[PDB]
Each structure stands twice: as C-alpha cells, then as structure tokens.
Amino acid sequence: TTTVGVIIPDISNIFYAELARGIEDIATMYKYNIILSNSDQNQDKELHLLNNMLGKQVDGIIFMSGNVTEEHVEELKKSPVPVVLAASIESTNQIPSVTIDYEQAAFDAVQSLIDSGHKNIAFVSGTLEEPINHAKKVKGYKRALTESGLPVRDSYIVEGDYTYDSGIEAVEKLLEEDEKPTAIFVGTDEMALGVIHGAQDRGLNVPNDLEIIGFDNTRLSTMVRPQLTSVVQPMYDIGAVAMRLLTKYMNKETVDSSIVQLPHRIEFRQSTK
Amino acid sequence: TTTVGVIIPDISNIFYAELARGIEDIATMYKYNIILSNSDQNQDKELHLLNNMLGKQVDGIIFMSGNVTEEHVEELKKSPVPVVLAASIESTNQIPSVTIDYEQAAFDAVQSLIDSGHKNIAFVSGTLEEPINHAKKVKGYKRALTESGLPVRDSYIVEGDYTYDSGIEAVEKLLEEDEKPTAIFVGTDEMALGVIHGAQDRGLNVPNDLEIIGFDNTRLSTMVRPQLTSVVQPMYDIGAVAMRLLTKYMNKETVDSSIVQLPHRIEFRQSTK
C-alpha cells in the first residue's frame, strides 16, 4: 500500500491547514494515507523532516514552505523518495512545484484597485526575505503602479510577518504618512483582518475610506466585516494536481512539465467599493 | 526515536490545530517526534487511521474527536500502543483522558451573564449528537438557568455544525423569537464569531444590545470586533498533562488516575459586560 507524507509550517495557520485538508480529501480519492508533520518554518526541522519522513517510510513527500533554500533544492535533490512542492516557490526551478502565478496575481490585484481610481496604493506583505514576496508579489505590485503612471513610493511597501497583530501594526504607520493610502493590498488574509480592524480600530471605514484586498481566500476572508476580497488560490486544485504529479513520479513515469502553474482570480466582496 | 502520534478530527478546526501545534511544543521538551493524522471528524476514518498508526510502531497515541462511541472504546481498548484522549470525552471512562469540566464551564459562563442581569440567555451549541454538548455543555447551561429561577425555553437552544455560517443562521433564527435573547452563549469561537456578525449585520450592537460569550479562547477571539469573551481552555496544560500520562503508559508505570480534569477560566473581553 502507499502512504504519502505532507509537511507544513504551521499546522494551525489556516492556509496550510486548509491546503492540508484538501490533500486529505484527494488522498481519500486515490486510497492514499496522509502523514503530516510540522517545521515551525525552521530549515533544520524541515531538512530533518525529510529524514523523519523516510525513517517513517512514506512513498512520496508534498513539501510546503514560504521559503526553499539552496540547501533544500540540494539535500532534497538526493531525497530517497519522490517529492513535489505545493503552493511554494523555489527560485532554482529544479524542484517539481505546482503553484499559481503569484507575480501576475499581485497584478490583477492592484489593477482593479486602479480600475477604481486609486492613485497611491500601499503594500503590506510578509517578510521580504522570503521569495514569494521580494521577487513575485512586490514586483506585480510595482508592475501596476509603474505601468499605470503612478509614482512607486518606497514608504508604500511595509514590512510584515504574517501576524494578525503584525497586520494591525502596518496600517498604523501607513496612516502616519502625509499621503493617506486610500487602498492597501495585503498578501495574506490573516494580516488583512489585521489591516481592516486597524483602520477601523482607529475610526476609518472600509471600503468607504480605505479599500482592502488580501491573498489566499480563506474562511478568514468571510469572517471579517466587511467580508474581505481575496485573490483566489485554487486550493483543492493545487493539492489536486500536486498529488497526481507525484503519483506520476512515484510510478517512475515522465513529467513533461514539472513546474506547473494553475489559474488564479479575485473574489470581490464588501471590503472594496 | 520516540514518535508519539496524535489523531485529529479536522486539521483545519482552529482549536484542534491550535492544540496539536502546542503538543509539538511539548514534543521538543520531551524529546519526542510527532506524526499527525486526520479522521475528518467522522467514524469510519478513525478505526482505520488507528490501524495506520499501529503499523508505524509509534510509541503511543493522543486521540481527539467530537464523539467517542461504544464502537470506539471497543478497539482503543485493545490497541497495540497506549492511547490517551485530550479535550475530548467518552461516556464509559474506559480509556484515559485529560480535559476540563465542560458542564461546569458552560454553567460558569452563562452564570456570568446572569450576574449581569440578563434573564434571557440563549445557547448556540454545536452538533447535538455529540455528547460533549447534549451531555455536558447543554446540561450545564440549563442548570445555571433553573438554579437562578430562570425558565429554560426549548426555542432558546439552537444547534449548529461548528461552521461560522451556522453561527450566523443561529443568531438570525434567535432574533426572530418573539422575546429576543439579551445574551447568547455560543459553544465555539468560530460559531460565536459568526453569531456576533449575524447580530451586527442586523443592526444590533455587541455588547450593548446583544451580549455574547464564546468557548475555547482560540486566536479568533482577538481577530474580531469586539474581541470575543471566551471560556479559556488550558491549551498547553491539556497538552502537557496528556504527554505526562502517555509517557507513564509507554514506560509502563502505574498512574495515580486515568481521567484528569483541568481548571478552566474566562477571558472577559469587549464582547460583553
């Protein structure tokens, strides 16, 4: 029989949680047995999980993390069993990875903010260190302002950390600036509920005083008020392809396209005029 | 070396994830390895999973579920490695467990409302089939009422399904009652969070208009406006004390008690007075 192993950053964190559920759902389709494991997002535990999973002998690994290092693409290269990344980037493009066009998405995201007539837009993203941010999402966000004749302010990109509280912190200062960012884009639902509450905890009204678009599209996007607009990341699908992609790599077959991208979109809601 | 394996019903369920994410914090202290599993909250996929944990020679098992039936103890009563329950109940008391006095916790909560004045307290509970509700949770709420000489109105106990939406349906259903509740006690942070929203979307204000009390004290409790007043459940302790017992059982040593209960408390927030 076959038992695949998934490994994520925060078993709690709604996104990896939901995503993980999907794999469960999809594994019950195939007749696979899922094995989860946490890394709290520190390479060591990640790299050692590559060893704990093998020692617990599992057919394939569905790796997950907002940061894949040089040592990963390397240590993982000789990994005993097949492995495909899920919803995660790997700048070297050597590792199999099924995801979305984060870069483009960030763009749809702020082109509509301009469709609305917003001129100076701000950006609250996770830790700039990680790849998805500094080289995919920030870019898409500049793609727009730059292409759509609009000064790329530097004070309009704020250092985040994925904490609802952190989110709250970003908007405090974004409101400090002489210019009032009448439209913020936040690369995460978690932080969005932070931004939304922050501007409200201070008196501003969303979306009549400050638009807000987030990422992931999680249950958290319908649990705010105004319900939040999130870029939709095809959860079930990502997990869905990622699984048959692996099934292929475990059947020692050939993968024509190893780095697959799925289509994204933007669900609009009461958090935007 | 020692790999303890925990079985959770819904890896997304903010509470169970928030608990299992803490177990792992207890994991590093005790030097153990954690392998997470998922049953999806339903029967069939639990006997099975339990069988998959046994084949991986894990040194022990920490189980979590919405309901533990006769069918269940039947196999956990004769299982390879040891097993202990966490924030979960089983009527017979055959198998171990570390929990809190739910009935009393419910009681305490609604009482708090009673001591505020409220004479009309509604209770939005999760699945009634599950004994942690119809046997404890409700049992408690009704008690607190009868005891303060307040009537127990059949129509004031609305059942949900743990989702944020059933929370919304619940308030909506309740606010149509000829005699409207002044305070609601919701059996879950998710639902409670949905309850406020429903109420708020209908023009009511929390707390001033409707007063509501959650349960679990997850992270959601501070990701809403107003911040939810919830019944605190000692996340860590439940994790630690359970590992203590398991360790005793794995090292095959005599345990002073098989069923343990931990003290609860209430984190009064802005969602109430």
Q: Which domains does chain B have, with CATH numbers?
A: 1-101+233-264 (3.40.50.2300), 102-232+265-273 (3.40.50.2300)
Whether the CB of A29 is below 8 Å from some CB of chain B: the reply is no
CB-nearest to A223 from B24, B45, B164 is: B164
Query: Which of A33, A86, A71 lies closest to A238 in space, CA to CA?
Result: A86
**Residues B135, B102: contact at Cβ < 8 Å?**
no
Closest CA to B185 of B142, B227, B223: B142
Q: How far is A56 from chain B (nearest CA, A)?
A: 7
**Closest CA relative to residue A230, chosen from A97, A108, A122, A119:** A108
Question: Diameter of chain A by CA atoms?
Answer: 63
Query: What Rg, from alpha-carbon coordinates, does chain A have?
Result: 19
Within 8 A by CB and 6+ apart from A57, the residues are none
Tokens of A250: 């475990």
- What element of type H or E holds A70? helix A70-75
State which residue of chain A sits closest to B224, comparing Cα positions. Answer: A224
Sheet holding B60-63, edge to edge: B33-38, B3-8, B60-63, B83-86, B97-100, B259-262
Q: Judge contact between B70 and B233, C-beta under 8 A.
A: no
Between chains, do A24 and B11 touch, taking CB under 8 Å as contact?
Answer: yes
Query: Amino acid letter at A148?
Result: S
Q: Cβ of A252: how many Cβ atoms within 10 Å?
A: 7
Nearest to A34 among B14, B38, B164 (CB): B38
Spell out which residues of chain B touch residue A35, defining contact as CB-CB under 8 Å. Answer: 35-37
- Name the amino acid, one letter, at A22: G
Check if the beta carbon of residue A3 is closer than 8 Å to that of residue A33: yes
CA–CA min distance B120, chain A (Å): 27
CB contact under 8 A, A33 and B52: yes
> Do the chains contact at B20 and A34, CB–CB below 8 Å?
no
Q: H-type helices in chain B, by residue range?
A: 14-29, 47-54, 70-76, 102-114, 131, 138-147, 164-174, 189-201, 235-250
Q: Which of residues 215-244 of A touch B (CB under 8 A)?
A: 219-220, 222-223, 225
Please, what is the Cα angle at B241 between B238 and B245, to 5 degrees? 130
- Torsion, Cα of A92, A215, A17, A258 (10° steps): -30
Resolution in A, one decimal? 3.0
Contacting residues of B for A20, CB less than 8 Å apart: 11-12, 38
Count CB-CB contacts under 10 A for residue A55: 13
Q: How far apart are CA A230 and CA A222, in angstroms?
A: 10
> What span, in angstroms and rounded, lies between the C-alpha atoms of A104 and A111?
10
Q: Is B85 helix (H, G, I), strand (E, B) or coil?
A: strand
A99 touches A258 (CB < 8 A): no
> Phi, psi at residue A83, to the nearest 5°?
-160, 140
Distance from C-alpha of A45 to C-alpha of A72, rounded to nearest angstrom:
12
* A27 in contact with B, Cβ within 8 Å: no
Closest residue to A11, CB basis, from B20, B190, B223: B20
Report H helices in B115-231. Answer: 131, 138-147, 164-174, 189-201
What is the bridge-based pairing of β-strands B60-63 and B3-8? parallel
* Residue length of chain A: 273
The minimum CA-CA distance between A198 and chain B, rounded to whole Å, is 10
Nearest to B176 by CA among B193, B159, B199, B205: B199
Contact criterion met (CB < 8 Å) for B33 and A40: no
Rounded to whole angstroms, the Cα distance separating A74 from A66 reads: 17
Pairing of strands A183-186, A158-159: unpaired
Nearest to A127 by CA among A159, A171, A90: A159
